[PDB]
Amino acid sequence: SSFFPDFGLLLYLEELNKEELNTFKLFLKETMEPEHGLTPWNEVKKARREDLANLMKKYYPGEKAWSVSLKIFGKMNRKDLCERAKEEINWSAQL
């Protein structure tokens, strides 16, 4: 359902350790620029996880914030997260 934007993004950010979260922010900067410009980066680079999930949903509404994060997990080699997402999305659609 609507689980993934409402709850999913934050839950997955919580599976990132401190170093991985910094890697995530850099991938996010790289994907948001130059289209979104330089304004969001100031929010991003100081945001804790809950704050990061919220600000992503401003620029990437609904499932878009979730979709952007998943691609980043794959690029940063957190393939365990990509696999869990597959499992969850596939089960949910079967409901």
XYZ file of C-alpha atoms in Angstrom:
95
model
C 0.000 0.000 0.000
C 1.319 3.416 1.090
C 3.689 1.777 3.588
C 6.862 2.514 1.672
C 6.751 6.319 1.567
C 5.037 6.625 4.969
C 7.313 4.234 6.869
C 9.686 2.406 4.522
C 12.228 5.106 3.715
C 12.961 5.860 7.389
C 13.108 2.167 8.321
C 15.755 1.601 5.635
C 17.779 4.693 6.578
C 17.975 3.146 10.044
C 19.824 0.155 8.532
C 22.625 2.504 7.507
C 25.438 3.058 10.009
C 26.992 6.505 10.475
C 29.504 6.126 7.628
C 26.905 4.650 5.256
C 24.531 7.539 5.968
C 27.263 9.974 4.888
C 27.780 7.952 1.699
C 23.995 8.073 1.182
C 23.928 11.875 1.541
C 26.648 12.184 -1.110
C 24.763 9.950 -3.588
C 21.667 12.073 -2.817
C 23.531 15.338 -3.506
C 24.763 13.802 -6.746
C 21.277 12.811 -7.887
C 19.520 16.016 -6.769
C 22.033 18.327 -8.515
C 22.124 20.220 -10.765
C 18.361 20.005 -11.353
C 17.261 20.770 -7.789
C 20.036 23.275 -7.373
C 22.124 23.999 -4.316
C 19.397 24.928 -1.814
C 18.484 21.433 -0.545
C 22.122 20.448 0.165
C 22.248 22.624 3.281
C 19.272 20.744 4.761
C 20.627 17.364 3.655
C 24.123 17.635 5.042
C 22.962 18.484 8.570
C 19.907 16.188 8.675
C 19.536 13.197 10.967
C 17.681 10.197 9.487
C 14.114 11.209 10.312
C 14.816 14.724 9.075
C 16.434 13.367 5.901
C 13.410 11.182 5.099
C 11.093 14.164 5.526
C 13.086 16.516 3.341
C 13.403 13.911 0.573
C 9.607 13.644 0.517
C 9.320 17.398 -0.154
C 11.331 17.119 -3.361
C 10.322 13.566 -4.280
C 6.702 13.178 -3.174
C 5.127 9.847 -2.264
C 6.823 6.745 -3.594
C 9.375 8.876 -5.432
C 11.436 9.419 -2.253
C 11.351 5.675 -1.723
C 12.264 4.938 -5.336
C 15.240 7.340 -5.278
C 16.569 5.797 -2.063
C 16.383 2.241 -3.409
C 18.499 3.082 -6.439
C 21.071 4.663 -4.131
C 21.145 1.557 -1.883
C 21.945 -0.444 -4.995
C 24.708 1.924 -6.088
C 26.319 1.968 -2.660
C 26.323 -1.868 -2.691
C 23.778 -2.285 0.083
C 22.321 -5.162 -1.907
C 20.791 -6.672 1.227
C 18.464 -3.645 1.268
C 17.584 -4.033 -2.428
C 16.729 -7.662 -1.777
C 14.533 -6.905 1.241
C 12.710 -4.251 -0.800
C 12.026 -6.778 -3.559
C 10.631 -9.261 -1.013
C 8.332 -6.674 0.577
C 7.105 -5.046 -2.624
C 6.439 -8.435 -4.271
C 4.496 -9.790 -1.257
C 2.437 -6.585 -0.911
C 1.354 -6.598 -4.573
C 0.231 -10.216 -4.179
C -2.173 -9.205 -1.395
